[PDB]
């Protein structure tokens, strides 16, 4: 994931960050204190950006042309995932974090498929 | 490029960082001091990574589905640029820096078209 | 701008980040959602800080003593630009973003002159 | 892992970075090219520091007084893990990476036990 | 503080960042402007996290087994300090900043004792 | 130092980073192992950049126009300090770290003078 190549990649990195995004959204629903809301906004923004970086890294650094041929929809899937993450970043609705988790889950399925074969 | 959205994008950001990459490769042929070679290596890894970030952001944050219908080669183009920037990161040969610039120039051409219509 | 030296500089880097600052200020007048206001605030703080970094780097890493003899107001100009960017960071008023851009435009004019002779 | 608290933590974040460390060390044995060795060293330093951050965050933000009560050896385990990561930073021997991984595994078991309550 | 080892550490780095935390908290009592409160919250989060990094680095990179031997309460002191910093992150009350500072002062005395040998 | 303004500034931040630069230089003189040299180069580059950021921050964010009038040589002093730090960054000679420490010491003298009055 580090560009050597070192060869170690796992969508879990994108996932755990996007799970933090959703968790923050959930918490924001429970406590309207402006200072808390602000800190939640700060943290959500950071985690969502890290999730994007991880998803982008799988796409540029791990996935190769044979993968793009086998999965013609992967380019657009990655793009939509990144857009979903930016949508979650801009929203307090955990359903937006969940949508981005849903997309990452589709990438993860494909990822582990390429690991078998 | 900050994800607000703020709507301020320019592939010049990627290009300037990719220019630094090619310039650093060029300097590496000029001075065999191991300390200098190592600093050039540090700097090149960082600038190439920034270039990759700028390219990725254009793709995810600036380009939208209408652009992708109009330019069906754009997803693959962005993927190629990022892989070219990875190849430059791994190399001392300025030809690799140039190849990354050439891809960026193709993104730049598409980008300014989308600013017209 | 990486300090190798690589010799690749362009005040466009500062300018684009300062444009994002003014754009974010402009958006803040458009949408009173507190969550949106807070994200705009996060993003503006970051982009202004990047702009300040780019300006500082030009001053320390690109401009050299001959430039300072030729442009004796340049030190104070750079100081003013950075303080203008701090003032924009602290404000929602796009006039502050504009003032920072105006100073950057003066650095830009000096910069391109030094590229000629 | 972000400090809201959001309550999302997983020692897998430290693991994955430490796996990269070990993977780099192994790659260093098979390509004596000076530029490659330098890049491998640069990347290793980065990923080892990320792994440390993730371990430190678990210890400061996730683990709580009753955990330190139940596991009187946790403080020292976390300290030994961080030192094992620094030892891996300073070394090309994959045995050092592996030792860091063995420590993170001890943290991972404790972590998941604490999530059972 | 960088992990060479270079052997240059000073708890003053944590102190200065924690002093900023407390200074922000105090400033928050005197300007109820929503934008100012938001920026103060953003900056506080950043500086508290820097202070934590500096404290964590001391503990992992500077302190050694004989220090932990001589000061059996060091592990818990460092943990309490990090938690005090998180409490300051989450609060507008300068008493929380001050408590973080009082903990860093306990670390600072121990540090300087260990530099006497 | 954080741009609120919070009002907390201390040249010690620049100093401790520049002291790390010098310490690394000293160590590089003692151990010619290429892996160690590389890691030292990495670390020195990072610390020197952080020292520059701190010096630049005093200059833009702390020092004000009354200070520049009272100390007409301060602008150029800061510029030369930053250049000295970039010189140390590019060198393994600790005398270069010491020169940058010398310059910071001149800034520090002025800084504490402005704190009295
Ligand atoms: Br890779
Ligand atoms: Br945007
Ligand atoms: Br340069
Ligand atoms: Br937490
Ligand atoms: Br150390
Ligand atoms: Br300030
Ligand atoms: Ni990797
Ligand atoms: Ni933007
Ligand atoms: Ni450069
Ligand atoms: Ni978290
Ligand atoms: Ni150090
Ligand atoms: Ni401050």
- HEC profile for chain F? CCCCCCCCCCCHHHHHHHHHHHHHHHHHCCCCCHHHHHHHHHHHHHHHHHHHHHHHHHHHHHCCHHHHHHCCCHHHHHHHHHHHHHHHHCCCCHHHHHHHHHHHHHHHHHHHHHHHC
Cα separation, A54 vs A61, whole angstroms: 10
* Interacting residues of E106 by C-beta distance below 8 A, sequence separation 6+: E77, E81
The tokens for E38 are 């938001």
Query: Which of D6, D12, D43 is the closest to A2 by Cβ?
Result: D43
Q: Domain holding C86: CATH number?
A: 1.20.120.400
CA distances (Å), origin A46, targets B49, C89, D1: 18, 19, 11
Q: Please tell me whether B67 is known to bind a ligand.
A: no
Centroid of chain to Cα C49: 9
User: Do C51 and C18 form a contact (C-beta atoms < 8 A)?
Assistant: yes
Burial annotation E3-26 (CB, 10 A radius, 16+ → b, else e): bbbbebbbbbbbbbbbbbbbbbbb
Residue among C11, C69, C68, C81 nearest F59 (CA): C81
Contact between C89 and F3 under an 8 Å Cβ cutoff? The reply is yes
Do the annotations mark residue E67 as ligand-binding? no
A-E CB pairs within 8 A amount to 18
- Tell me which of B37, B40, B41 to substitute to probe the interface with D (most D C-beta atoms closer than 10 Å): B41
Cβ-contact C88, C99 below 8 angstroms:
yes
For residue D64, what is the DSSP state? -
Left (φ > 0), alpha (ψ -120 to 50) or beta: where does D7 sit?
left
d(CA A90, CA A98): 14
Among candidates D22, D113, D12, D117, which has minimal Cα distance to D58? D12
Whether residue A55 contacts residue A10, with contact meaning beta carbons closer than 8 Å, is answered with no
φ, ψ of residue C37 in degrees (nearest 5): -55, -40
> Helix, strand or coil for residue B63?
coil
Which residue has tokens 């010398």? F102
d(CA B8, CA B6): 6
DSSP for C67-78, please give it.
Answer: HHHH-TTHHHHH
Residue to substitute from A45, A86, A87, A94, interface C, most C β-carbons within 10 A: A45
| E78 neighbors E59 (Cβ within 8 angstroms) | yes
Both tokens assigned to C79? 């100081």
Angle, in degrees to the nearest 10, between helices F34-57 and B34-57: 60
**CB D14 within 8 Å of CB D104:** yes
The CA distance from B8 to C31, in Å, is: 18
- What is the domain extent for residue A99? 1-117
Q: Is C41 near chain E, with CB under 8 Å? A: yes
* H or E element at residue C115: none
Residue C63 three-state SS:
coil
Ramachandran bin of E7, using left for φ above 0, alpha for ψ from -120 to 50, beta for the remaining angles: left
Query: What one-character DSSP code corresponds to residue D3?
Result: S
CA B89 to CA B82: how far, in whole Å? 10
Burial-class residue E29 by CB neighbours within 10 Å (0-12, 13-18, 19+).
exposed
- Report the alpha-carbon distance of residue E56 to residue E75 in Å, rounded: 11
Residue of E43, A17, E86 whose CA lies nearest to D57: E86
- Tell me how many residue pairs between chain C and chain E have CB atoms under 8 A apart: 18
Cβ–Cβ gap B39/F41 under 8 Å: yes
Question: How far apart are alpha carbons F18 and F99 in whole angstroms?
Answer: 10
The answer to whether residues F51 and F81 touch, using CB atoms and an 8 Å cutoff, is no
| Cα–Cα distance, D53 to D40 (Å, whole number) | 20
Cα(C55)–Cα(F57) distance, integer angstroms? 12
- Tell me which residue of F12, F110, F34, F5 sits closest to F68, measured CA to CA: F110
Whether D40 and chain A come into contact, CB under 8 Å, resolves to yes
- Euclidean distance between CA atoms D86 and A77, whole angstroms: 38
Query: What is the Cα–Cα distance from E87 to E97, expressed in whole angstroms?
Result: 8
Q: Which helix (H) or strand (E) holds E6?
A: none
| Per-chain residues with Cβ under 5 A from ion ligand 8 | B 1-2, 6; C 20
Using alpha carbons, select from E34, E38, C45, C42 the residue that is nearest to residue F2.
C45
The span from the CA of E53 to the CA of D113, in Å, is 27
Of A82, C37, C11, residue with least CA distance to E42: C37
Residues of F in contact with E8 (CB under 8 A): 16, 19-20, 23
Method: X-ray
H/E element, C61? none
* Separation of CA D5 from chain center: 21
DSSP state of E115: T
Distance CA F19, CA F12 (A): 10
Separation in Å, CA D21 to CA A7, B100, C80, D97, F19: 11, 28, 45, 6, 29
C58 Cα distance to chain centroid: 10
Q: What are the tokens at A106?
A: 């589709």
A62 membership: H or E segment, kind and range: none
Q: Within 10 Å of residue F102's Cβ, how many Cβ atoms?
A: 12
- Asked if C43 contacts C24 with a C-beta cutoff of 8 angstroms, the reply is yes
Neighbours of F116 (CB within 10 A): 5
Please confirm whether the linkage preceding B16 is cis (ω < 30° from 0).
no
Report residue E20 CA to chain centroid gap.
10
Ramachandran class of D9: left when φ > 0, alpha when ψ lies in -120 to 50, beta otherwise:
beta
Residue that is written with structure tokens 């320019």 in the block:
B10
Evaluate the CA torsion angle E21, A23, C30, B113 in order and state its sign: positive
User: Does E35 belong to an annotated binding site?
Assistant: no
Report d(CA E21, CA E18) in Å as an integer.
5
Dihedral sign, Cα of residue C80, residue C81, residue C85, residue C87: positive
E68 Cβ contact list (under 8 Å, min separation 6): D76, D79, E74, E75
Q: Tell me the CB-side half-sphere exposure of residue C109, using CA atoms within 13 A.
A: 9
Tokens of E116: 């006497």
* Closest ligand to the CA of B50: 9
Overall residue count recorded for chain C in this entry: 117
CA of E115 to the centre of ligand 4 (A): 33
* C-alpha span between E62 and E5 (Å, rounded): 9
In whole angstroms, give the CA distance from residue E46 to residue E40: 10
A59 vs B: CB within 8 A: yes
State how far the alpha carbon of F41 is from the alpha carbons of A49, B47, B78, C91, in Å. 29, 17, 33, 40
Token pair listed for D110: 């404790």
Residue in this structure with the two tokens 């990495």, named with its chain if needed:
F42
- Output phi, psi for A88, to 5 deg: -65, -40
CA distances from C39 to A39, A66, E88, E111 (A): 11, 39, 22, 40
In whole angstroms, give the CA distance from residue C13 to residue D13: 33
Helices (H), chain C: 12-28, 34-57, 65-70, 74-89, 94-114
Whether C23 contacts chain B with CB within 8 A: yes
Burial class (CB in 10 A: 0-12, 13-18, 19+), D58: buried
The two tokens of residue B78 are 């962005």
Rounded to whole angstroms, how far apart are CA atoms E55 and D79?
13
Q: Do A38 and C38 touch (CB under 8 A)?
A: yes
- Residues D54 and D58: their CA atoms lie apart, in Å, by 6
Determine the longest span between alpha carbons in chain D, in angstroms.
51
Q: What's the total number of domains in chain F?
A: 1
- Distance, CA of F45 to CA of B72 (rounded, Å): 42
- The number of angstroms, rounded, from the C-alpha of A110 to the middle of its chain's C-alpha atoms is 14
Query: In terms of C-beta density within 10 A (0-12 exposed, 13-18 middle, 19 or more buried), how is residue B4 classed?
Result: buried
The pair of structure tokens assigned to B52 is 């990759």
């Amino acid at each position: 994931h580090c560009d050597l190549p070192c060869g170690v990649f796992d969508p879990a990195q994108a996932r755990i960050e996007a799970e933090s995004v959703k968790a923050v959204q959930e918490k924001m629903a429970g406590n309207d204190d402006p200072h808390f809301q602000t800190r939640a906004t700060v943290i959500k923004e950071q985690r969502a950006e890290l999730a994007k970086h991880h998803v982008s890294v799988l796409w540029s650094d791990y996935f190769k042309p044979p993968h793009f041929e086998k999965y013609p929809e992967l380019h657009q899937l990655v793009n939509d995932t990144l857009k979903a993450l930016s949508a979650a970043k801009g929203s307090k609705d955990p359903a937006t974090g969940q949508k981005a988790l849903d997309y990452i889950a589709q990438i993860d399925k494909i990822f582990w498929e390429t690991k078998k074969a």
